[PDB]
Design a protein around this ligand. Structure first.
Ligand SMILES: [Mg+2]
Ligand SMILES: [Mg+2]
Ligand SMILES: [Mg+2]
Ligand SMILES: [Mg+2]
Ligand SMILES: [Mg+2]
Ligand SMILES: [Mg+2]
Ligand SMILES: [Mg+2]
Ligand SMILES: [Mg+2]
Ligand SMILES: [Mg+2]
Ligand SMILES: [Mg+2]
Ligand SMILES: [Mg+2]
Ligand SMILES: [Mg+2]
Ligand SMILES: [Mg+2]
Ligand SMILES: [Mg+2]
Ligand SMILES: [Mg+2]
Ligand SMILES: [Mg+2]
Ligand SMILES: [Mg+2]
Ligand SMILES: [Mg+2]
Ligand SMILES: [Mg+2]
Ligand SMILES: [Mg+2]
Lengths: 87, 144, 155, 129, 150
RNA sequence: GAAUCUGGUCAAACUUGGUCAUUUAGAGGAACUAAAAGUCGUAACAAGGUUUCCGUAGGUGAACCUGCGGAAGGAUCAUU
RNA sequence: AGGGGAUCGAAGAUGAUCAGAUACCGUCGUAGUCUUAACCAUAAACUAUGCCGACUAGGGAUCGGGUGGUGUUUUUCUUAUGACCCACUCGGCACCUUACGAGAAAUCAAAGUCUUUGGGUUCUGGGGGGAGUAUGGUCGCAAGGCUGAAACUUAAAGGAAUU
RNA sequence: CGGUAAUUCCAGCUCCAGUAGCGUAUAUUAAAGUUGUUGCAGUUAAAAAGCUCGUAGUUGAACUUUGGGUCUGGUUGUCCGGUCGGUUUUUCAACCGGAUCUUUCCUUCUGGCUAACCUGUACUCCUUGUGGGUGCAGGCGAACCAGGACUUUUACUUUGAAAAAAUUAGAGUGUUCAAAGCAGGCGAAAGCUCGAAUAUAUUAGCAUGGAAUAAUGGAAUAGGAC
RNA sequence: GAUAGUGGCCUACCAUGGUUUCAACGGGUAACGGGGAAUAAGGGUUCGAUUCCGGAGAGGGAGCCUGAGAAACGGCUACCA
């Protein structure tokens, strides 16, 4: 990581998925960046500022991805009620 | 877990199992049974002297064609009648009949070489001069 | 072990160089010689209260415990005054990094200072070669009963 | 027969991590398992975990961080002799550097680094890298 | 996963979380004990007694209500059988099978089942010997087994 | 205290018989490979021109055939 | 070794067919096919998948049991049952999709959780031939079985796919 | 490769390798995760017994003191160097260790020995005094003896002792270097020197600390404990 | 009894043990045993006649004399080769 006296090495510091903490790989030709807009009253969708997620390929491939995204939303306050702790 | 008791006081079963298994490996079996001393013409030695009984041109194995200029040799120590091939450009012009001849293996851990059927040994030192030397004339035959 | 009789051989036997004077008045009559074996063993009273002679006893004989002191289960009681302890241990083969339940039978002479039954653990001691194979004397049959007074289930 | 219980505990955990479950249920759950989990926690591999006091045997619910990669328990508990430790770590762990070999010792179920520091080792249980 | 077949059942009696008495379910402990002893006197065997208690009377498990087990209670009052209940039942079954075999000379399946029964008995016998409930060097089989039954 | 002699004793050895093993004779007997421009069929590979196979019994130039029961490694993953 | 001997049917006949056919097809036909005493222990005895155990992915079906239904339905009034029906749920015999795992591949919810190699245990294999032979044991009334070599000998013999 | 243009034969030529060497034969280790403890395969490539039982063998649910604080020493860095490149405390932590009380005892006492105060008998040399103790009658035992009692027993594991030398790894040293050897090295070039280190070799013993792990056993006619 | 001394070491008498699938006993060994040698991850395999330590053996079997110490072999005594 760091070469002794500070000095950061190891480039391309991997994106980790927000749902699984599993590293998003270099050729993750499956993964995605989800961008959700921070929003305000009357019109207003505030350009430039998003609450963002990354979902790793593997979860999506498995199929259970929507629910994970919902969970993420409910945590960052982008939803309420939609997804519950107990199923 | 597959076979082998990944156990801990397991060890005797493991050891015995290994012993039993080993015999299927050829080399180990040969070493243990002592195939070297009971069979395979030479006394498990590298080289053996024998006596040129009769020169035989053995007709070679398939794709290839030729006659292979070997010698039926009776070994001194065991008394076994082998067929030892002789290398290079004739050199039976060196071998003659009823001569003492030192033989080698062939490179094939016993077994057969290349294309010569029923043959196991090279000849090296004929009468005590070595075939290569005779052929390349670096040293020459002791008259008769 | 012996079990009764006391003085039943072709010869008649006593402890050597130990002598009972007929001249002196004693109600105890016979003077028994005993030996405190040492090594933190309590020398069983069933020798001092005892009546047997037995030359290969560690207490009432010339046999003396030195060197090794081992333990282990009694397999066999089937022969007279001696026992077969089975000292079972785990020996290690590095090639596998693992162990063997290994056998080995110690024959040990048993003084009749003990009641030894099959299965009882015995602190046995090394000594002067008793005979042929037997080079140990039973010192402590530590398992006193092992449920013998309380075997019955009913209250 | 569920012969070894630690093994069982780890296997399910491993499976969960592989899928991407955030939580696992471990069926039998011992002192030993709990200690192992505590060790894992101490170096931050496992999240919170909740031992249900079943009025029976046990039950452990785990929270997974996604920081786990493989948790292995080695099959017999090889008695291990302070130098053996080095060999084991070379074999079992992805670097001379990080991750832990979780060996039980007389001083308790530690990782390997801790054991080395304490200068005591014993039998191995698992590892976490 | 089942001692003798390829079958892997999980039909089993469960148990409640509370080791404490189930509150409202009245009576006492002494009464329960008395009932148990009466049942024992009548010739019923532990499991049967328990069953009787559970259904007709206000009993869940004697352990919960009395403190001690059924078998333990029996032992205390000195009414328990000499050969443990399960073992006894096994022996009876074996005897029955033997009887059947005596009659039917060609009945291979029955013979096979008898073998299994015998094996089970042996296992049980061994474990009783270990925990010392059958006096040691007592083997239970074919000739004496019948005599033992009743 | 010398040869010598009675009894032991350890006993080499020697005459006997019977086990074994390394070996070389081995009258004859059937095998197996290597050689693969002999002889006859064509058995198998295509439904290989009777689908092949297995276990078994009988038969016979020879591959083999045929009973009986199993397989499909079948040429059928299929009937309201 | 007795019985019973219908059918079919190793052998045999016997007709064709064929260069030839004591092969295939046709017609008889003992042994056998049933069965009582015994034996023999092998089979492609195959799911060609050792047994236990835990876990990971859905899905309907289907058999066995079991609760939950103001469910339908039989009516002999309310019915109480059975037979369905729907939701489960254990246990099984399988199957269909996906592979996020395997695997060489074909394929597989196990052949998964194995180079990130370690749940417990049996047993078996070590290139092909020679050879499941020879010899020795054995267990067989025999046929045979279980065990089971080496000498030689050869660069392939194999698998699973593709053109 | 060779059946008339042979990159494989036989020669010459250049060339390549290694080189005072280099090749051939037979073993053997490595390669060989092709013998697999680490670490192999078993549907179909060889291989899962026809099936079940079963004795040895191997393997075996979970459960018995977990916690907190209090006080006391070590070892790394942090922060300065206080100093003529090193030095130790405070500011600071992690880190191992010990002593403890907690509802928690370390095998137990016969007497040595008490060492110091739980101490006080007179009180004071003395900064207006808990700055400071020479001192002898009730009484802390662990600061360890010797002497009994009786220690559930192992496997582990740490430290220790012994594991002959040589060999191996390794400390020093100019055998001219090197393999080596155990020497050498330094003065006024008118006698003084370091030296010949360490460390493994687990296995069976033996001694010691640890008490998780894995056993094993105690109190259920209690002839159980005090 | 013997021996330097213990001991089935041998003798007398009595008892019926002891070893074994946790491989006894056999059979092999082209087996003297270690220390070690080669092999260059980790585990390992093979190899150790041989410079050190043991142990046997002096053609083979025996038997003994002397002496502190030999069952000696550059010491005897047979017998077989
Ligand atoms: Mg056709
Ligand atoms: Mg054909
Ligand atoms: Mg055909
Ligand atoms: Mg095949
Ligand atoms: Mg015809
Ligand atoms: Mg015919
Ligand atoms: Mg078979
Ligand atoms: Mg099969
Ligand atoms: Mg083979
Ligand atoms: Mg040319
Ligand atoms: Mg390797
Ligand atoms: Mg292989
Ligand atoms: Mg096959
Ligand atoms: Mg060196
Ligand atoms: Mg050796
Ligand atoms: Mg040597
Ligand atoms: Mg030699
Ligand atoms: Mg000589
Ligand atoms: Mg001499
Ligand atoms: Mg001599």
């Amino acid at each position: 990581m760091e070469n002794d006296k500070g000095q950061l090495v190891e480039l391309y510091v991997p994106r980790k998925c927000s749902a699984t903490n599993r590293i998003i790989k270099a050729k993750d030709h499956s993964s995605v960046q989800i961008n959700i807009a921070q929003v305000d009253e009357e019109g207003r969708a505030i350009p430039g500022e998003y609450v963002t997620y990354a979902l790793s390929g593997y979860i999506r491939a498995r199929g259970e991805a929507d629910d994970s995204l919902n969970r993420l939303a409910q945590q960052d306050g982008l939803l309420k009620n939609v997804w519950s702790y107990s199923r | 877990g597959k076979g082998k008791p990944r156990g801990l006081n397991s060890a005797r079963k493991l050891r015995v199992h290994r012993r039993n298994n080993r015999w299927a490996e050829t080399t180990y079996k040969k070493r243990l049974l002592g195939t070297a001393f009971k069979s395979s013409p030479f006394g498990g030695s590298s080289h053996a002297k024998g006596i040129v009984l009769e020169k035989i041109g053995i007709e070679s194995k398939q794709p290839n064609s030729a006659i292979r200029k070997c010698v039926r040799v009776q070994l001194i120590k065991n008394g076994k009648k082998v067929t030892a091939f002789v290398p290079n450009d004739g050199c039976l012009n060196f071998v003659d009949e009823n001569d003492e001849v030192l033989l080698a293996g062939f490179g094939r851990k016993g077994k057969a070489k290349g294309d010569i059927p029923g043959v196991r040994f090279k000849v090296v030192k004929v009468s005590g001069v070595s075939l290569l030397a005779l052929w390349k004339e670096k040293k020459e035959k002791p008259r008769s | 072990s012996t079990e009764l009789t006391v003085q039943s051989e072709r010869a008649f036997q006593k402890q050597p160089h130990i002598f009972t004077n007929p001249k002196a008045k004693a109600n105890r009559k016979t003077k028994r010689w005993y030996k405190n074996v040492g090594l933190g063993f309590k020398t069983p009273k069933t020798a001092i209260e005892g009546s047997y002679i037995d030359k290969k006893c560690p207490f009432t004989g010339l046999v003396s415990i030195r060197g090794k002191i081992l333990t282990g289960t009694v397999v066999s009681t089937r022969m007279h005054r001696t026992i077969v302890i089975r000292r079972d241990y785990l020996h290690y083969v590095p090639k596998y990094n693992r162990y063997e339940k290994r056998h080995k039978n110690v024959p040990a002479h048993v003084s009749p200072a003990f009641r030894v039954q099959v299965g009882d653990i015995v602190t046995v001691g090394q000594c002067r070669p008793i005979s042929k194979t037997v080079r140990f004397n039973v010192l402590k049959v530590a398992s006193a009963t092992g449920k013998a007074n309380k075997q019955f289930a009913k209250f | 027969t569920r012969t070894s219980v630690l093994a069982d505990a780890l296997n399910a955990i491993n499976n969960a991590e592989k899928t991407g479950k955030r939580q696992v249920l471990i069926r039998p759950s011992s002192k030993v398992i709990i200690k192992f989990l505590q060790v894992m926690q101490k170096h931050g591999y496992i999240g919170e975990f909740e031992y249900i006091d079943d009025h029976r045997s046990g039950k452990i619910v785990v929270q997974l961080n996604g920081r786990l990669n493989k948790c292995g328990v080695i099959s017999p508990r090889f008695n291990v002799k302070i130098a053996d430790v080095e060999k084991w770590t070379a074999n079992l762990l992805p670097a001379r550097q990080f991750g832990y070999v979780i060996l039980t010792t007389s001083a308790g179920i530690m990782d390997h680094e801790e054991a080395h520091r304490k200068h005591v080792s014993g039998k191995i249980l698992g590892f976490v890298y | 996963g089942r001692m003798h077949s390829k079958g892997k059942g999980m039909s089993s009696s469960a148990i409640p979380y509370s080791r404490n008495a189930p509150a409202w379910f009245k009576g006492s402990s002494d009464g329960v004990v008395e009932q148990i002893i009466k049942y024992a006197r009548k010739g019923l065997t532990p499991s049967q007694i328990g069953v009787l208690l559970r259904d007709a009377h206000g009993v869940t498990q004697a352990k919960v209500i009395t403190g001690n087990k059924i078998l333990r209670i029996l032992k205390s009052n000195g009414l328990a059988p000499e050969i443990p209940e399960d073992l006894y039942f096994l022996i009876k079954k074996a005897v029955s099978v033997r009887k059947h075999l005596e009659r039917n000379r060609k009945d291979k399946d029955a013979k096979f089942r008898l073998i299994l029964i015998e094996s089970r008995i042996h296992r049980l016998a061994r474990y009783y010997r270990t925990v010392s409930v059958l006096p040691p060097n007592w083997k239970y089989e074919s000739a004496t087994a019948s005599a033992l039954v009743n």
